[PDB]
């Protein structure tokens, strides 16, 4: 009858752990442990202990936007707001740097990863500067259609015909 | 090199503060929020997704063949069982929550 | 949808017989079905949507500019609170159910 | 104290209606009505009557595929299976006609609406016959890439 918990009732017996979604209500002193299911969106036992009760659901604030909601089984997880990423050297939510004109998107701005841009290579261009558009391919007119603006690392080409 | 790019940019978010929705049947209806019944807060969360915009480019969706097709990104619904309230009575119903953003073609005549 | 055409064809269906899923946390898990507790049948329905296929054309998604972009349609997930069971214990968790099918670009080098 | 129900307890009083998700358990004879919530996925009171109980959830069979599940508040709705549409003159689920080669999709096969195809117009074509692909635009070759097959209302052009 190995006790998993490590706590024993006074009577000598092994103490009943409180599983996930169950936190400690009254410890196994005189009697056994009394477990009660957690409140949703409010508390949670994300562990199996005869000691630990229903902890309070992590709240999200400011740049803490929610990624996973809080349930009895598991706590809620917050992450950086739409615009930003978690800074490994600031522990704070800094905002995604944009891919300026003449430059495009390569990998987007994830939770821990800042925007990764790229200098628009031969034959591409960037209309604007944001962390959404990548480099687009340049129009090519036609050996017929007259060519007005040629294509630059920062603006598409322009044309017209008869 | 993902390095891969959507054709309709989209923004998803967790929606705890939801107070209105539309019956699957099509019937406008309301949701619950604070619901401080029992000193608690309860709450119903949903995962909504919608479009950065209709035309992420002047041509429409990102990277269609703008030469033969017109395009425009729209929002796609899906249904969830959640707790609603139609007037006095309040029961469980299925609500049409946004869930993704996808581009829609149409050809050009000539 | 008027003479308008998707870029990734999709098929949506109601899924009462669902018995496996993936924890939002990422943890494989199981659902309930018959659950004949009380002579009833209960049941949990979900509205799943997936892809007709990866490449609805030889080029990929329907009507991208195949000349500059490679494309392929993939399935997009969303999360629902539903009743799961991790081994002995069975509680409510969020499961990543398919919900739409959307095309994903990548450029070509030269 | 207008009775909404139209039924009165023996004592003269007005009878308690059973709202949505609540069906009649014991009618308002001697006493008031006794309401009980419906069983999910099984029964449903989609009405407010002091008479009506929890009706049985409409079941889907054969070509009846489910559109809306059954809940206490509302009955489940079935509709034609993926392939088919409801026929206004057969009351039966008939299958979506496909858009044959040389023809493409225009409006898809909905619940009450059969496939609507279109003859591939000037400059388009249909690989196959299904109720999914529309008419696609024809390749246009180039200066190089000698033109081999020209584009037909039923097959793309070919070059290289």
From Swiss-Prot, chains B, C:
It comes from the Eukaryota. Transmembrane segments: none annotated. Induction: Expression oscillates in a circadian manner in the suprachiasmatic nucleus (SCN) of the brain. Detected in submaxillary gland (at protein level). Highly expressed in male submaxillary gland. Levels are much lower in female submaxillary gland. It is found in: Secreted; Endosome lumen. Changing residue 81 to L: Near loss of the ability to trigger histamine release from mast cells. No effect on interaction with NTRK1. Disulfide bonds join 8-73, 51-101, 61-103. A 1-acyl-sn-glycero-3-phospho-(1D-myo-inositol) binds at residues 43, 45, 81. A 1-acyl-sn-glycero-3-phospho-L-serine binds at residues 43, 81. Belongs to the NGF-beta family. Nerve growth factor is important for the development and maintenance of the sympathetic and sensory nervous systems. Extracellular ligand for the NTRK1 and NGFR receptors, activates cellular signaling cascades to regulate neuronal proliferation, differentiation and survival. The immature NGF precursor (proNGF) functions as a ligand for the heterodimeric receptor formed by SORCS2 and NGFR, and activates cellular signaling cascades that lead to inactivation of RAC1 and/or RAC2, reorganization of the actin cytoskeleton and neuronal growth cone collapse. Homodimer. The homodimer interacts with a single NTRK1 chain. The homodimer interacts with a single NGFR chain. The NGF dimer interacts with a single SORCS2 chain (via extracellular domain). The NGF precursor (proNGF) binds to a receptor complex formed by SORT1 and NGFR, which leads to NGF endocytosis. Both mature NGF and the immature NGF precursor (proNGF) interact with SORCS2 and with the heterodimer formed by SORCS2 and NGFR (via extracellular domains). The NGF precursor (proNGF) has much higher affinity for SORCS2 than mature NGF. This is Beta-nerve growth factor. It comes from Mus musculus. The chain holds residues 129 to 238 of 241 of the full protein.
From Swiss-Prot, chain D:
Coiled coil: none annotated. TNFR-Cys repeats lie at residues 2-35, 37-78, 79-117, 119-159. Glycans are attached at residues 31, 41. Subject to intramembrane proteolytic cleavage by the gamma-secretase complex, giving rise to an intracellular fragment that is rapidly degraded via the proteasome. N- and O-glycosylated. Residues 1-160 are extracellular. Disulfide bonds join 3-14, 15-28, 18-35, 38-54, 57-70, 60-78, 80-93, 96-109, 99-117, 120-135, 138-151, 141-159. It is found in: Cell membrane; Cytoplasm; Perikaryon; Cell projection, Growth cone. Homodimer; disulfide-linked. Heterodimer with SORCS2. The extracellular domains of the heterodimer bind NGF. The cytoplasmic region of the heterodimer binds TRIO. NGF binding mediates dissociation of TRIO from the receptor complex. Interacts with RTN4R. Interacts with TRAF2, TRAF4 and TRAF6. Interacts with PTPN13 and RANBP9. Interacts through TRAF6 with SQSTM1 which bridges NGFR to NTRK1. Interacts with BEX1. Interacts with BEX3. Interacts with KIDINS220 and NTRK1. Can form a ternary complex with NTRK1 and KIDINS220 and this complex is affected by the expression levels of KIDINS220. Low affinity receptor which can bind to NGF, BDNF, NTF3, and NTF4. Forms a heterodimeric receptor with SORCS2 that binds the precursor forms of NGF, BDNF and NTF3 with high affinity, and has much lower affinity for mature NGF and BDNF. In response to proNGF binding, the heterodimeric receptor with SORCS2 activates a signaling cascade that leads to decreased Rac activity, reorganization of the actin cytoskeleton and neuronal growth cone collapse. Plays an important role in differentiation and survival of specific neuronal populations during development. It comes from the Eukaryota. Death domain is responsible for interaction with RANBP9. It also mediates interaction with ARHGDIA and RIPK2. The extracellular domain is responsible for interaction with NTRK1. This is Tumor necrosis factor receptor superfamily member 16. It comes from Rattus norvegicus.
């Amino acid at each position: 009858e190995t006790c998993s918990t490590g706590l024993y009732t006074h009577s000598g017996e092994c103490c009943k752990a409180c599983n996930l979604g169950e936190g400690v209500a009254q410890p196994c002193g005189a009697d056994q442990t009394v477990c009660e299911p957690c409140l949703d969106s409010v508390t949670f036992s994300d562990v199996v202990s005869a000691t630990e009760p229903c902890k309070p659901c992590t709240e999200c604030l400011g740049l803490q936007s929610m990624s996973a909601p809080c349930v009895e089984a598991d706590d809620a997880v917050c992450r950086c707001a739409y615009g930003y990423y978690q800074d490994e050297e600031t522990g704070h939510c800094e905002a995604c740097s944009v891919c300026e004109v003449g430059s495009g998107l390569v990998f987007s701005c994830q939770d821990k990863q800042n925007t990764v841009c790229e200098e628009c290579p031969e034959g591409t261009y960037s209309d604007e500067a944001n962390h959404v558009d990548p480099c687009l391919p340049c129009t090519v007119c036609e050996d017929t259609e007259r060519q007005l603006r040629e294509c630059t690392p920062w603006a598409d080409a322009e044309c017209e015909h008869h | 090199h993902m390095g891969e790019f959507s054709v309709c940019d989209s923004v998803s978010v967790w929606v705890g503060d939801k107070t209105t929705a539309t019956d699957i049947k099509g019937k406008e209806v309301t949701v619950l929020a604070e619901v401080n019944i029992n000193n608690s807060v309860f709450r119903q969360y949903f995962f909504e997704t919608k479009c950065r915009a209709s035309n992420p480019v002047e041509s429409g969706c990102r990277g269609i063949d703008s030469k033969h097709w017109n395009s425009y990104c729209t929002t796609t619904h899906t249904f969830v069982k959640a707790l609603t309230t139609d007037e006095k009575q309040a029961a469980w119903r299925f609500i049409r929550i946004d869930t993704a953003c996808v581009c829609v073609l149409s050809r050009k005549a000539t």
